[PDB]
Paper text:
Most strikingly, EtRON2D3 bound approximately 275 fold tighter to [name]ΔDIIloop (8.0 nM or greater) relative to [name] (2.2 μM). The 2.20 Å resolution crystal structure of [name]ΔDIIloop in complex with EtRON2D3 showed clear electron density for the peptide seated in the apical groove. Three complexes in the asymmetric unit showed little variation in overall structure ([name]ΔDIIloop: 0.32/0.60 Å rmsd over 392/387 Cα, chain A compared to C/E; EtRON2D3: 0.23/0.32 Å rmsd over 39/39 Cα, chain B compared to D/F), although an O-linked glycosylation on Thr425 of the [name]-DIII linker was modelled only in chain A. Since EtRON2D3 chain D showed the lowest thermal motion, the [name]ΔDIIloop chain C complex with EtRON2D3 chain D was used for further analyses unless otherwise noted. EtRON2D3 bound throughout the apical groove of [name]ΔDIIloop in the expected conformation based on previous [name]-RON2 co-structures, with the EtRON2D3 N-terminal helix seated in the area exposed by the absence of the [name] [name] loop, followed by a length of ordered coil, a beta-hairpin loop, and ordered C-terminal coil that extends back through the apical groove. In contrast to previously characterized [name]-RON2 complexes, the electron density surrounding the cysteine residues of EtRON2D3 (Cys1278 and Cys1288) revealed a population with only a partially formed disulfide bond. While the second cysteine (Cys1288) was appropriately positioned to form the disulfide, density based refinement of the occupancy for the first cysteine (Cys1278) showed 41 to 74% oriented away from the central axis of the disulfide bond (inset). An initial comparison of the [name]-TgRON2D3 and [name]ΔDIIloop-EtRON2D3 interfaces revealed similar overall buried surface areas (~3400 Å2 for each complex), but an overlay of the TgRON2D3 peptide on the [name]ΔDIIloop-EtRON2D3 complex shows key areas of divergence. Most importantly, the N-terminal helix adopts a different angle between the two peptides, the coil leading up to the first cysteine is restructured, and the tip of the cystine loop is shifted.
Author numbering:
A (entry chain A): 68 to 339, 360 to 479
B (entry chain B): 1259 to 1297
The structure:
Amino acid sequence: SGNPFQANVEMKTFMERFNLTHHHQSGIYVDLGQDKEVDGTLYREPAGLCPIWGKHIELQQPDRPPYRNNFLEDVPTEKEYKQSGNPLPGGFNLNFVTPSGQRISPFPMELLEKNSNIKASTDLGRCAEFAFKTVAMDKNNKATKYRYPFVYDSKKRLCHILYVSMQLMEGKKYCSVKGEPPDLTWYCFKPRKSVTENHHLIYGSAYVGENPDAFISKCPNQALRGYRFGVWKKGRCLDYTELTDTVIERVESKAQCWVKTFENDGVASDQPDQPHSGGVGRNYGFYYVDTTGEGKCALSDQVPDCLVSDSAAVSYTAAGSLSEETPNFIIPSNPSVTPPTPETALQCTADKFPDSFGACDVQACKRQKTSCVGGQIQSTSVDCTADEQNEC
Amino acid sequence: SASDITQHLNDSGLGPAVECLENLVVGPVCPAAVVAPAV
Ligand SMILES: *[C@@H]1O[C@H](CO)[C@@H](O)[C@H](O)[C@H]1NC(C)=O
Ligand SMILES: *[C@H]1O[C@H](CO)[C@H](O)[C@H](O)[C@H]1NC(C)=O
């Protein structure tokens, strides 16, 4: 014990944002965590409480008009479907309108940020809240508790409600790839994160809108620069590369690792059988440079409870963004309610923060070293004393 | 073999056929034209 990343309330609060099992509580790759009854029938419903940065649904429609291969396109009318022929054209976007003909989706952020029914402190929160305050009506025109997921486009500042809650469909038995086989209604599609594309798209269930300010402090929205995720054992912080169940893969770039934390086969998924991952899975990872200078990605399902300092490393989660920097569309205007930055949470001053060494871990013959450098907490493992090395 | 596909669709998150959604900001909303039922 003596984990400096659990030493106090603030620190714990900071480290708890990385526990997706606790805060997100649902699938990430595919989120279908809840079940809701509509007109006597049960349906699966996305339920995750954290926004998923960069997540989009890649479609596999034919590369000809009228197909656009863009899940933010309106869902097709029966007429359009008849006109195109198989597979379904269009996308996942809700195309419903008011009696006067006003779209509910996409919905401009300017109309939300000064509205009465919207109390969220950030644009993303406002989109989420907009989604949460949208429910399906049943046959008797009574309100259900079935809600639709959303996508916030932060570049265009547009909030999308998705009529389609499906996130993955594969297999020639169920769907076609570029129109093959032509007998099938559905095109194949899957969740993706891209090294370059669609970083501005944020996917979420409606329920991140239930408490639309929470995600700001309870979710790991941004990548963590200069540290490796680790687990605290035998008096020291073991970064994932020291654990046996950890998956280590070669990468050309840190973005690839960021993508891998979301796309690897062990990530929390509710895809079929109706599994509820509850947010458990290989959701955590980091990019690091090995001793030879090659880029590596370490992936783990162990919830991090400590950090190992490494300036070239970057720690990612399946839920978070590639970028380390906090964008303005999740910063409240009131400074007094913003959460501590990583720099603040991990701050120290050398004259108040002593260099310390932990007891020797004889199994690895290493010990914790915790110190203050550049006004930030350094956490590493170093050699045991010459005296201690006899016990190794 | 066709019920199985249906079941797979339901298991994959295929939603209910609804005519109307209620939104607190803009009120009730409906499709102006019939949506493709397979969606
Ligand atoms: C993460 O959260 C889950 C659910 O609350 C909990 O069981 C688990 O112990 C937590 N792991 C940590 C804090 O490392
Ligand atoms: C949060 O950020 C704001 C600026 O957006 C202020 O700097 C505020 O002091 C910060 N508070 C915390 C908890 O770090």
